């Protein structure tokens, strides 16, 4: 159930029918891998199987040494936060003398425990791998002797299975300076991530959504290497909590809009600079100017408030009547009359200024409709490919209904006489005052 409208007046398109999945806050969890305080062993035999585990154990001993070494459009309007601050905060909580013992004592006999830290926060805690119970109990007392013998070849292979995950965890942390994203299946397997979500202090609708899009729960999560103390290796996974769900969203698409004069440099240009994602949130509209930070799965839209503006709900009025009394819609000015196509959810915006040859094609027979010079639009219904100049555009073959909103292009309402052509961030009531300053004042003189 997806719909889309295009405004012939403003060279812009709105795509309604998308559901919200906003990331309001973060949740922190503490992953642990119990380790093995082990030194240079004593057995120096030449048995083929022994030299295999002797070098495999050095992979464990050096992987620990490596982590130990670590611990010694309007994006200019957006704010600046520290995404991993919540996880780094929990990390420094784990430094305090006694905080690591609480985790091991609560993980002494179970592989999952709810620990209340010093600062009065309950964090889900996970013990993920038993290398200590295998190396200390079955492997170390043989190597730390003079001569040592390995029973089975299958023991070597079984060791490689156990040691592999720890090496691949170290591999990511060594290459990402202790902070990795998206959180790989090594830092958290689907079985572990889903058991986290089901036991997070969150809503049953909140778990329903996370479970269906774990591939997007991963891209919006961080894993932070924290401490390796005593015989414990703990790294914090910072999972998102979605506090605004199932509200209606809509995506605005904008392209340059110029006059249609034939002579060079005789054209004035205007472009709507409020494109991006919009979703209803507590009576206001959260505007994400960077649509790249939002991720679209089917009709669900996962965004991060860190890349949002909290705007009044009057911004929605900027679609029907652009001027209006309530909200002052934002626009940029220029004189660059260059053709460019923008692909929307159910179509593609066509701006064909100049000598550019712009057309819309079908896979049975291309170039079914031709565009005159100006900013026009055609639905994806029946159209497969679109060409503007030397750039061929493939239109989204997603189904849905289209609606063409007709109107006179707004650029014809402006006198190109003293039209300010270098207003990067301005607005309509600011453009009209930019008119009166060069209209009224020059008239009186």
């Amino acid at each position: 159930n997806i719909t889309e409208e295009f405004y012939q007046s403003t060279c812009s398109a709105v795509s309604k029918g998308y559901l919200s999945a906003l990331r309001t806050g973060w949740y922190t969890s503490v992953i642990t891998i119990e380790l093995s305080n082990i030194k240079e062993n004593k057995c120096n035999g030449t048995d083929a199987k022994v030299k295999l585990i002797k070098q495999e154990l050095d992979k464990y001993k050096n992987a620990v040494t490596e982590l130990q070494l670590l611990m010694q459009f309007l994006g200019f309007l957006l704010g600046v936060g520290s995404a991993i601050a919540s996880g780094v905060a929990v990390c420094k909580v784990l430094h305090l003398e006694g905080e690591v013992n609480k985790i091991k004592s609560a993980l002494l006999s179970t592989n999952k425990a709810v620990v209340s830290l010093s600062n009065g926060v309950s964090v889900l805690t996970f013990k993920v791998l038993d290398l200590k119970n295998y190396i200390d109990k079955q492997l170390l007392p043989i190597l730390n002797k003079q001569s040592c013998s390995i029973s089975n070849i299958e023991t070597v292979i079984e060791f490689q299975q156990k040691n592999n995950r720890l090496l691949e965890i170290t591999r990511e942390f060594s290459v990402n300076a202790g902070v990795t994203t998206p959180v790989s299946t090594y830092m958290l397997t689907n079985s572990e991530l889903l058991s986290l979500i089901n036991d997070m202090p969150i809503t049953n609708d909140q778990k329903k959504l996370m479970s269906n899009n774990v591939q997007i729960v991963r891209q919006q999560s961080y894993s932070i290497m924290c401490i390796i103390k005593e015989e414990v290796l703990a790294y914090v996974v910072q999972l998102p909590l979605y506090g605004v769900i199932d509200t209606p969203c809509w995506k605005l698409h904008t392209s340059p809009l110029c006059t249609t004069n034939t002579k060079e440099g005789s054209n004035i240009c205007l472009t709507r600079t409020d494109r991006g994602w919009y979703c209803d949130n507590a009576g206001s509209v959260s505007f994400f100017p960077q649509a790249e930070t939002c991720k679209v799965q089917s009709n669900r839209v996962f965004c991060d408030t860190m890349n949002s503006l909290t705007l009044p709900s009057e911004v929605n009025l900027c679609n029907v009547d652009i001027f209006n009394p309530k909200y002052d819609c934002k626009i940029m000015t220029s004189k660059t009359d260059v053709s460019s196509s923008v692909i929307t959810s159910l179509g593609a915006i066509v701006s064909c200024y100049g000598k550019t040859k712009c057309t819309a094609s079908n896979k049975n027979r291309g170039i079914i409709k031709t565009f005159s010079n100006g900013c026009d639009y055609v639905s994806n219904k029946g159209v497969d490919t679109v060409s503007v100049g030397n750039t061929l555009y493939y239109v989204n073959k997603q189904e849905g209904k289209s609606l063409y909103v007709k109107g006179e292009p707004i650029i014809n309402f402006y006198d190109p006489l003293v039209f300010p052509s270098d207003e990067f961030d301005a607005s309509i009531s600011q453009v009209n005052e930019k008119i009166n300053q060069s209209l009224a004042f020059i008239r009186k003189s």
Partner: antibody
Amino acid sequence: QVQLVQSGAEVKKPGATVKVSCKISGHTLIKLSIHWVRQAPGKGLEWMGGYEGEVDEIFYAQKFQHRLTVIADTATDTVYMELGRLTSDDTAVYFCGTLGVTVTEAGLGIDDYWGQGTLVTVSS
Amino acid sequence: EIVLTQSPGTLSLSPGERATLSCRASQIVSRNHLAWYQQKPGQAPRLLIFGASSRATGIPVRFSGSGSGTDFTLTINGLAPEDFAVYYCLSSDSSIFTFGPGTKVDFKR
């Protein structure tokens, strides 16, 4: 460079009690197995008793359990054997040796460290 | 109690020949807990083969162990002159050690 150095030769009179030492250098007693093995002149090897450092337990063969004591001093890495009511049948060379074998599921390991022996001649 | 017997008493062979030394138990002994020791006159015992077939650190490849249950076999595949001494087998059941009578490897004349 592990080295096990025993006490010197002893001469004891019938019915006496002999103390033989085994001092450990280059290694720790709590990770070692230390057992006493004696060899009468021209005869085979005979195990008497020992101490397993990993478990901190002392074992005795039933033939000598009534008159043999083994002591483990972890602070000085020294193990003693104390054998009383000696007879001419006890005239032998006494060795301390790491006989213990530790077995786990991945495999099994052993130490092979020995002293130099201690001669005990028992006659009146 | 476990009573270990070895055979033959004296094994007479020349360097380059194969030595085959037996050790047999009155009751089943654990394969992990049977070892082969070498003792030359005047010296302390020396471990050759532990855990039935495993070889000790720094023992030549010519020494090989085998055996299970009650019958065990130390095999020297090509005797060297330093190998002519006494070879004892050693079993252990619940940390109770018992030594074999001893097999002596002799110079064949």
